[PDB]
Ligand binder design. Sequence first.
Ligand SMILES: *[C@H]1O[C@H](CO)[C@@H](O)[C@H](O)[C@H]1F
Length: 440
Amino acid sequence: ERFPADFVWGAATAAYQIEGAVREDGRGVSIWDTFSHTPGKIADGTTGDVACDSYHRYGEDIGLLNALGMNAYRFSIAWPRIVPLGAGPINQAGLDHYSRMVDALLGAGLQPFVTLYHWDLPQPLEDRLGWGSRATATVFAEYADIVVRQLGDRVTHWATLNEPWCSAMLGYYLGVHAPGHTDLKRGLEASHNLLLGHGLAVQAMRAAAPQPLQIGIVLNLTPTYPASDSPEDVAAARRFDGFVNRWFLDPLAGRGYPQDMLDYYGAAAPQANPEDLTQIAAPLDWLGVNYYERMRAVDAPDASLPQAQRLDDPDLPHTADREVYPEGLYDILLRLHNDYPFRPLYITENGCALHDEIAEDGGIHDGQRQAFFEAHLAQLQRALAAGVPLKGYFAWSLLDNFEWAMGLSMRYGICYTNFETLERRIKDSGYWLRDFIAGQ
Ligand SMILES: *[C@H]1O[C@H](CO)[C@@H](O)[C@H](O)[C@H]1F
């Protein structure tokens, strides 16, 4: 029934999804500015130019966090505000903005959980191949050093990357996210340079830190289940598990890249010399798990790599964009606790999208999102009972925001955002979370 008294209860955002103010105070151009302003890439013709205007309205966001009784806020720093050319001089005005925002959070009793990279690579670095270049890993570590020097007196909990699988595979292989390339070899090279950048940044941050820091990385993980016990379906499940999960977990854990996936990728695999793998396995203080969905895998030899297709389950609840399977959160946490060395663990993203509207009474009656939270929180209690060292939970998202290639049309907030007036309103699920947390 009860969570630990010191459990972290928060909500999460990312800079490009909320901030707007894309040309203000020296901000440079990111790959997502370029991508969202490319005709046809965003489903509804919107961009992050304004989004939630949280660059100006972060005080309102703090007011919402306080009204919800949260004790932490997970947000990202925009690299284009800090080093507008990607590699080059710092923009002190960008650092000062986040310094003030951190002070406002601390003044409100909210612990800042900062993500350094949540997908907004400076465009000048992409012009020089982006994550396809080792040099980008080096300059990412330089950016991490700069930020920790100025904010590390007040922020203890830092993550390097958010969801490198998305940045690499959606951005460079499937082309659905920025920068929009469609090449497997580039995607796999990007995955390696993201991990290398992570490892270099961890070392740089520890050297630059004014106090001991708690440094993690945030991974999206998908528990995978074979559709049947046939050799073909089991192998498809293992391949998909390798494609999403083990490709990142194993090198972070000092186990190299998984051999079965190296064999499967063949010549497309990156050239990983042992010096890189040692750097990638820099010791971490925590791991963040982003969980939305499972994969029930059926062999699909004709389909594209990794030749595994999802078997939809029509009996399970579905949201606006995903299947709901709360038990998969328990499964993946038990697997991490038993099979991998990372601890403690935080749930750094969990939430759902719905076709939310403001009702006649003024509220947003998002019962499915309340049920979503209730079901996933119950699975966390089961995991804690099994001894999983879970230390906090972050709802995705504090407010409806710019949802990448879906634009403003996919609402994940516990607070509703009117994108015309920028008013925020707490949804019913947000009041449920408030009251649940207060009971803890
Ligand atoms: C986790 O997934 C949500 C929903 O797709 C995104 O909005 C976040 O940026 C991502 F980190």
